[PDB]
Structure 1
Amino acid sequence: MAKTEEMVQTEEMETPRLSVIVTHSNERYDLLVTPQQGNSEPVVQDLAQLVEEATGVPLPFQKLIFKGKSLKEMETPLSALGMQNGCRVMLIGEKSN
């Protein structure tokens, strides 16, 4: 279950086959990593957008607790935004869909 040494998930414009595992209690959605930074290295709003765009749920309606940080516009440096193929993200609460 070492989702790190892969780099072969869902490819996009800048994202080199990078998708994150968005889990919600049991529900899981595949969302592409936020680019416009450094391909494998996403932006600070990455973890925030990953869970948000995962099902179209506003940030204040969920609670992202993963990647060694919390949901926000900016928390921990990008270098700690899960330096891998998206990493894993989970939120506690509900989801607006």
Structure 2
Amino acid sequence: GSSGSSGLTVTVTHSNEKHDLHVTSQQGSSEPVVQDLAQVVEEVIGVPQSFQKLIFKGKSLKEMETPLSALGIQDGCRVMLIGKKNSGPSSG
């Protein structure tokens, strides 16, 4: 058979748990970058880039324009995310 894809399958741990997410390109860039990774989270997990903190290999990923490949991330990896998820009765 034949198998292949563009995006990448990387898990993102936030709430002392693991959340598998599928990263994809920005319908324009040959390959997806950290930027997308951050979005996939706020879009999947539910945490804003202002509350979530990316961390890989003990390094806090703070670069979006940077390719996930450069940081060392690639289809089949586990990224650590530090932040607060929408939990608890909030009124305002």
Normalising by the residue count of structure 1, what TM-score does the alignment of the two structures yield?
0.58
> Does residue 45 of structure 1 match 2:35?
yes
Deviations 1:2-26 (A, max 9, x none): xxxxxx8xx87x43xx311111252
Structure 1: runs of 5+ lacking an equivalent: 1-7
Larger radius of gyration: 2
Give how far 1:69 is off: 4.8
Q: 1:50 is paired with a residue of what secondary structure? A: helix
Q: Deviations 1:57-81 (Å, cap 9, x if unpaired)?
A: 111111111275524543xx31414
Instruction: Report the number of matched residues.
Output: 81
- SS where residue 91 of structure 1 aligns? strand
Name the % identity. Answer: 60
CA contact (8 A) 2:47 2:83 kept: no
Unpaired stretches in structure 2, ≥5 consecutive residues: 88-92
Provide the C-alpha distance between the structure 2 equivalents of 1:96 and 1:85, rounded to a whole number of angstroms.
27
SS at match of 2:42: helix
What TM-score do the two structures reach when normalised by structure 2? Answer: 0.61
